[PDB]
């Protein structure tokens, strides 16, 4: 019924911005935290950053802080990931999720609907 | 049909579980809205709390009025043999005693009181310490565990194996001294000055009384937390190896390096604890009016 598509993202050269985009259908946008996560192979799963459901407050990794900027718009139930000065190991497959705003969660993997995410290839 | 000790045993653990129960969702509103930094640091919470009303209409409008009681069963497995065990032995330890206000002056009979309270808390502790150790132990492994950090212990027999292969039983009683001394005050003047107080002022249609009897437990508990307070400091900081060489070392130090005040600092938030406490020594009494 509710479905996350991740729009956005191929092959770019390091250094190079891109922007990636999640289309949540289903569901009331405007009351669900946005979280961006990313998966290569061999390498567990991590957690990027998250946007609050009214776009008010976002919180991110250290390990990209300062690097990515995540933004909302709910006039077109979307959520974006702006992603700056890459390096090789950002490749990656990043999926993005959308759970209840102020419910407590169990941590930052514990979230309602998930999508199914989009390839991300930085050249050298 | 019972021995005169099972009776106040189940009295006072019976007692414990409902007053632990009854102030249980207080606590919990208490701890969601003073711990939600630290939980949309860890991910657990998205957005902070904009007043106890709605922190209240959030957490119960999810998973329904239940949720208050969250963690609940825990704290009465903690307090129930804790409590049965301190108002069991303090009947006993008074009737060891024996004094009669009239037959022995009053001052002798509330340091009867005293004595008794004291001794009971001391009991208790030497029977319940290890478990609340290896309990915190498990939890911590659970912890851990739940975020992929390699586990420890199977279960408590498995921390109790390894704690007493370790280091024995001293590994399990880790911290007692300091631990009590707290409780030797603590436990002296909760039950101490609750029964050397209540026959003074709950007198006539107060004899029998509820409210009464749990204001003045109220109080006995702030006071006496109080009191009990600064030993507390130094058993925490003894035990935060999970620095400091003997309790009088830290004690000394401490007032030395930071200061008397700081060794009282924390002393607001026993006000909780305060209520929990109070209402088992009131439904105790009460317990026993229908009993007896
Ligand atoms: C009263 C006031 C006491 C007081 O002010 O003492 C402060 C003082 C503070 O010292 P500290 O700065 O903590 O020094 C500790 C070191 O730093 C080092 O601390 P640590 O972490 O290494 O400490 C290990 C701890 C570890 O302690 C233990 O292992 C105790 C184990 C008890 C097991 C009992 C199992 C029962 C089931 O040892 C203790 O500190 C306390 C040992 C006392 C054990 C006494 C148990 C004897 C019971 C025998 C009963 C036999 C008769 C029965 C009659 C029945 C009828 O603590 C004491 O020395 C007094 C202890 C009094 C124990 C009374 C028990 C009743
Ligand atoms: C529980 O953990 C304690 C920690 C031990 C010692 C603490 C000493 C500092 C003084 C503070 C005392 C407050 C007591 C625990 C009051 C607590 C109250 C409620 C609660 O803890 O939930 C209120 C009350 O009943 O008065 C253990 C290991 C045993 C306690 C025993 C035997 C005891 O309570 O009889």
Same mark, same amino acid.
């Given at each position: 019924?509710?479905?996350?598509?991740?729009?956005?993202?191929?092959?770019?050269?390091?250094?190079?911005?891109?922007?990636?985009? #999640?289309?949540?259908?289903?569901?009331?946008?405007?009351?669900?935290?946005?979280?961006?996560?990313?998966?290569?192979?061999?390498?567990?799963?991590?957690?990027?950053?998250?946007?609050?459901?009214?776009?008010?407050?976002?919180?991110?990794?250290?390990?990209?802080?300062?690097?990515?900027?995540?933004?909302?718009?709910?006039?077109?139930?979307?959520?974006?990931?702006?992603?700056?000065?890459?390096?090789?190991?950002?490749?990656?497959?990043?999926?993005?999720?959308?759970?209840?705003?102020?419910?407590?969660?169990?941590?930052?993997?514990?979230?309602?609907?998930?999508?199914?995410?989009?390839?991300?290839?930085?050249?050298? | 049909?019972?021995?005169?000790?099972?009776?106040?045993?189940?009295?006072?653990?019976?007692?414990?579980?409902?007053?632990?129960?009854?102030?249980?969702?207080?606590?919990?509103?208490?701890?969601?809205?003073?711990?939600?930094?630290?939980?949309?640091?860890?991910?657990?919470?998205?957005?902070?709390?904009?007043?106890?009303?709605?922190?209240?209409?959030?957490?119960?409008?999810?998973?329904?009025?239940?949720?208050?009681?969250?963690?609940?069963?825990?704290?009465?497995?903690?307090?129930?043999?804790?409590?049965?065990?301190?108002?069991?032995?303090?009947?006993?330890?008074?009737?060891?005693?024996?004094?009669?206000?009239?037959?022995?002056?009053?001052?002798?009979?509330?340091?009867?009181?005293?004595?008794?309270?004291?001794?009971?808390?001391?009991?208790?502790?030497?029977?319940?310490?290890?478990?609340?150790?290896?309990?915190?132990?498990?939890?911590?492994?659970?912890?851990?565990?739940?975020?992929?950090?390699?586990?420890?212990?199977?279960?408590?027999?498995?921390?109790?194996?390894?704690?007493?292969?370790?280091?024995?039983?001293?590994?399990?009683?880790?911290?007692?001294?300091?631990?009590?001394?707290?409780?030797?005050?603590?436990?002296?003047?909760?039950?101490?000055?609750?029964?050397?107080?209540?026959?003074?002022?709950?007198?006539?249609?107060?004899?029998?009384?509820?409210?009464?009897?749990?204001?003045?437990?109220? #109080?006995?508990?702030?006071?006496?937390?109080?009191?009990?307070?600064?030993?507390?400091?130094?058993?925490?900081?003894?035990?935060?190896?999970?620095?400091?060489?003997?309790?009088?070392?830290?004690?000394?130090?401490?007032?030395?390096?930071?200061?008397?005040?700081?060794?009282?600092?924390?002393?607001?938030?026993?006000?909780?604890?305060?209520?929990?406490?109070?209402?088992?020594?009131?439904?105790?009494?009460?317990?026993?009016?229908?009993?007896?």
């Amino acid at each position: 019924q509710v479905q996350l598509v991740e729009s956005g993202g191929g092959l770019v050269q390091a250094g190079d911005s891109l922007r990636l985009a #999640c289309a949540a259908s289903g569901i009331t946008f405007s009351s669900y935290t946005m979280g961006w996560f990313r998966q290569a192979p061999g390498k567990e799963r991590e957690y990027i950053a998250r946007i609050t459901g009214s776009g008010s407050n976002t919180y991110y990794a250290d390990s990209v802080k300062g690097r990515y900027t995540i933004s909302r718009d709910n006039a077109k139930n979307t959520a974006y990931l702006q992603m700056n000065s890459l390096k090789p190991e950002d490749t990656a497959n990043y999926y993005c999720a959308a759970r209840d705003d102020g419910r407590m969660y169990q941590g930052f993997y514990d979230f309602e609907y998930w999508g199914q995410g989009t390839q991300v290839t930085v050249s050298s | 049909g019972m021995p005169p000790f099972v009776v106040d045993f189940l009295m006072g653990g019976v007692s414990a579980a409902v007053s632990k129960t009854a102030a249980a969702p207080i606590e919990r509103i208490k701890l969601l809205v003073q711990n939600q930094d630290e939980m949309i640091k860890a991910g657990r919470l998205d957005r902070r709390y904009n007043g106890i009303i709605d922190c209240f209409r959030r957490t119960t409008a999810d998973e329904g009025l239940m949720a208050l009681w969250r963690g609940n069963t825990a704290n009465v497995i903690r307090y129930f043999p804790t409590q049965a065990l301190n108002f069991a032995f303090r009947d006993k330890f008074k009737a060891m005693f024996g004094y009669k206000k009239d037959k022995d002056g009053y001052a002798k009979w509330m340091a009867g009181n005293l004595a008794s309270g004291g001794a009971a808390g001391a009991t208790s502790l030497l029977f319940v310490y290890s478990l609340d150790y290896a309990r915190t132990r498990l939890a911590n492994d659970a912890k851990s565990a739940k975020g992929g950090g390699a586990r420890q212990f199977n279960g408590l027999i498995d921390v109790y194996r390894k704690t007493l292969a370790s280091d024995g039983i001293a590994g399990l009683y880790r911290g007692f001294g300091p631990s009590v001394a707290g409780i030797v005050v603590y436990r002296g003047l909760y039950f101490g000055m609750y029964d050397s107080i209540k026959p003074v002022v709950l007198v006539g249609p107060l004899a029998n009384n509820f409210l009464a009897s749990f204001l003045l437990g109220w #109080c006995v508990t702030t006071g006496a937390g109080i009191a009990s307070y600064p030993l507390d400091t130094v058993r925490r900081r003894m035990m935060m190896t999970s620095k400091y060489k003997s309790s009088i070392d830290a004690f000394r130090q401490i007032i030395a390096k930071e200061g008397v005040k700081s060794l009282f600092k924390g002393a607001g938030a026993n006000i909780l604890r305060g209520v929990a406490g109070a209402g088992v020594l009131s439904i105790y009494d009460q317990l026993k009016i229908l009993l007896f």
